[PDB]
Amino acid sequence: QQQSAFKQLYTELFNNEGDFSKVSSNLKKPLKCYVKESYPHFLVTDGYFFVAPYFTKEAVNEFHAKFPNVNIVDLTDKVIVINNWSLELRRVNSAEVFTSYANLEARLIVHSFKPNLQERLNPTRYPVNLFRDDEFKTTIQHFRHTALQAAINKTVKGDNLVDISKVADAAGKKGKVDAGIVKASASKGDEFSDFSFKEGNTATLKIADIFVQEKG
């Protein structure tokens, strides 16, 4: 049994075509998370891993006007509760976004959250980036392997075997190794992008902007 709520949640999302509706229902209950950091990166934990929640402009407007005496970027070390939330896959640049892997990111879309300040959370293990976990990275690789195999089997069709004469009696033959490069998909660009999952599009608020709204 998976003890990390975030790991089990994110893994199921990747193991179900990035379709949140296909994710088990008994895991869609409100999340009680400890805030590890609030700025420059707002990171919450579940006692094992930390993830970066994405707040909708509505979730923020509700929080501001339901808890006006509370600054979100001042929630470090504070415990929050996410009542309304969803999950969705997004294509990202992993060289820039540390909360992702292999250019893929499972985002926690927050629609409603309340702060349970002054509530001491039970000590635990030091939280690590879920997207740096051995098994989770592997789960994401499986997802890409599936998409890669589907595309290659769709793109490469019929006979494409190197003619045996080309590798026989090759003593006087020379070739360029780039002859062995086969495109996995008809797509444009050096990066593989022929996935079949429905990429999320939920517009979220950038953390550096919730800072100005709250602290100029």
Binding site: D134, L148, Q149, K173
Partner: protein, 461 residues
């Protein structure tokens, strides 16, 4: 003139900076504690302080601790191997919970210098380069380091002592680590001494070590390529500070922290020697994973001939995108590489073996049966790897056996697969294993007319 004092003889009273030479047996990785402070903690010994009092029969190591403080990461020593020697200038000494703790503020006036006990430092071994001299420190704090002619005897004698010590004692005694089969019983972090059975390149930044210790237990752990570039299959290492991963269901995983360290042992190490011979891989995890629909652990399906066991590996990125523009790559025709198979052609396994007419250099289906020439394999793998993980490409690797290359890859002698059901079945099973997620191939290839053909490699499953 610097006066060097032995560890047990250093003064606990004089307010004052002392200097010494010592053998490093353990060390954290240099780590940050706050916005302007880095620390590296080391366990050190010398002829006067190295073993605890025993009215019995199991020798436990005695040591002093050295705590180096600095304001920059670069001012601290990165210890990759137990047994090397450190020289410290201007350290203070005090008792910390009954033990001798030498402290040194590298940011103020203290300094350190590392000397290799073996002929080459870990870094020099990695890049295959001789040392300047036996008296030259391979690493040191500040812009300069001076070795006085009178010091030479201290270094040479300590080196001789270090080898006698490591070859006569375990050094890293049983009280300094936890058996992997008991890792789950630990309350917090612990240390490990294990053999690296495999180094799996998970991605361009990360290695995954498959470890096994004296208890027979297997665990996997992530190891950044930049941080620990000295990890090698078959070598014994001590891991300083690992935690049992409670969230790993599919496989046994150890979690490392920024302060954790993976260190090897100098050649003379009795412990490393004994563990290298005693510990072996039986592939239990791999065999069990093959029965699962999805394996979260990698399975290296093949092994290369012993004559290539020492051959260095080349990535697909290099093999296919640089082999015609890199001086070193253009100089070779034989390479070793690792990859996973995305697709196998022809799709029909029955057509993997064809008849070959040497005279016309043409192959043909055996479905018509009766001698179309010598039977050969004509299989093509479309492969991918860590170095090409994100691109939109797959790479052709061939198994064309007309001249012997790769003949026994499948452990199935070429035969008419339309007629021999036994051979066909073995090959169908192999195909499914080869295209299964997390299955990898470790193969030696020969470049021929722009193509890479597998040779001297065989499946082990």
């Amino acid at each position: 003139k610097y006066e060097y004092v032995e560890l047990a003889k250093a003064s606990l009273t004089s307010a004052q900076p002392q200097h010494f030479y010592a053998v490093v047996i353990d060390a954290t990785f240099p780590y940050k504690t706050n916005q302007e402070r880095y620390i590296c903690s080391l366990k050190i010994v010398d002829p006067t302080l190295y073993l605890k009092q025993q009215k019995g029969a199991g020798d436990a190591s005695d040591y002093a601790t050295l705590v180096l403080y600095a304001k920059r990461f670069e001012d601290l020593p990165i210890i990759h191997r137990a047994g090397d020697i450190i020289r410290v200038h201007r350290a203070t000494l005090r008792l910390y919970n009954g033990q001798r703790q030498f402290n040194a503020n590298v940011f103020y006036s203290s300094s350190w210098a590392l000397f290799s006990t073996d002929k080459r430092s870990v870094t020099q071994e990695i890049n295959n380069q001789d040392a300047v001299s036996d008296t030259t420190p391979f690493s040191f704090s500040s812009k300069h380091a001076t070795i006085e002619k009178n010091e030479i005897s201290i270094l040479q004698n300590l080196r001789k002592w270090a080898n006698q010590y490591f070859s006569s004692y375990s050094v890293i005694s049983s009280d300094m680590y936890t058996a992997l089969n008991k890792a789950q019983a630990q309350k917090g972090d612990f240390d490990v001494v294990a053999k690296i059975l495999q180094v799996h390149e998970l991605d361009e930044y990360t290695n995954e070590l498959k470890l096994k210790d004296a208890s027979g237990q297997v665990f996997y752990t992530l190891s950044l390529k930049l941080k620990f570039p000295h990890v090698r299959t078959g070598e014994v290492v001590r891991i300083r500070s690992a935690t049992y991963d409670e969230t790993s269901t599919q496989k046994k995983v150890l979690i490392l922290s920024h302060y954790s360290n993976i260190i090897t042992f100098i050649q003379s190490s009795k412990l490393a020697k004994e563990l290298r011979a005693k510990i072996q891989d039986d592939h239990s995890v791999e065999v069990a994973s093959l029965k699962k629909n999805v394996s979260l652990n990698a399975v290296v399906l093949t092994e290369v001939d012993k004559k290539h066991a020492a051959l260095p590996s080349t990535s697909l990125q290099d093999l296919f995108h640089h082999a015609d523009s890199d001086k070193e790559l253009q100089a070779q025709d034989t390479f070793r590489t690792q990859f996973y198979v995305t697709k196998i052609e022809p799709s029909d396994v029955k057509e993997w073996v064809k008849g070959y007419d040497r005279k016309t250099k043409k192959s043909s289906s055996l479905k018509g049966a009766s001698g179309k020439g010598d039977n050969i394999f004509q299989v093509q793998f479309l492969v991918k790897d860590a170095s090409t993980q994100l691109n939109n490409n797959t790479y052709r690797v061939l198994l064309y056996t007309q001249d012997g290359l790769g003949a026994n890859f499948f452990n199935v002698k070429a035969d008419n697969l339309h007629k021999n059901a036994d051979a066909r079945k073995k090959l169908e099973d192999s195909a499914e294993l080869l295209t299964k997620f997390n299955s990898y191939v470790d193969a030696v290839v020969e470049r021929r007319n722009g193509f890479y053909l597998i040779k001297d490699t065989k499946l082990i499953y």
